[PDB]
């Protein structure tokens with residue numbers, strides 16, 4: 224699939240940089256024709272078949288195809304796609320409130336964010352989309368100054384359609400947040416996202432990462448072994464029902480882990 228090959232600078236003006244990654248940079252931008260503001264994600268293309276730098280066109284097209292499907296208040300939306308010899312440029316919804324990461328919470332404040340995350344993931348999983356990269360860095364806010372901000376899931380760079388219940392691909396996500404099946408290179412499905420939500424919930428309530436070791440290999444080994452516990456110093460005033468929610472997500476066997484529908488019916492969440 225080919226994208227718009229006119230010069231993006233003829234239609235948008237860029238401004239403040241919003242984020243920077245290994246093969247992508249995100250810049251605030253403004254469309255000349257409407258004055259409306261967006262985020263332009265510039266993704267570096269691979270320049271040869273066998274190269275390791277840049278993103279393969281297969282991976283870019285999968286991300287764009289997934290982004291084109293989604294329209295939900297808790298997920299970022301795609302406006303337009305451009306390309307040139309060097310980059311594919313996604314013109315994405317502007318989410319300006321910064322990361323949930325940059326932003327310890329009470330259980331009401333945690334659940335207010337968490338319910339929005341669960342609503343967004345329920346939408347994705349309903350469409351058989353696994354995100355595969357859920358972490359606080361990929362949960363942004365629309366306005367960080369209100370008492371209960373509205374969140375958007377970003378970064379569909381690892382997302383995959385799961386039309387056979389599982390996919391057999393390697394997912395190089397962030398060690399602190401990936402499920403054991405990712406660590407062990409096993410078939411992957413929607414369940415991996417539910418583990419990541421469990422990690423996110425643990426951090427939201429305590430300010431501490433449940434599996435984090437001193438090195439990446441330590442973290443991965445801890446994930447695979449389900450080596451975590453609720454430290455009383457951090458959880459002494461957290462309800463047992465909040466701990467129950469986390470415990471039913473941080474489960475090694477994906478078949479025994481709570482699904483997104485289970486998580487919405489769990490007594491800590493269900494109104």
Ligand SMILES: Oc1cc(O)cc(/C=C/c2ccc(O)cc2O)c1
Nearest residue numbers: 241242262316317318377378379380
């Ligand atoms: O408005 C903003 C601000 C910001 O810091 C990041 C983004 C989007 C990042 C992003 C979204 C979708 C995707 O497939 C990949 C991405 O990197 C949007």
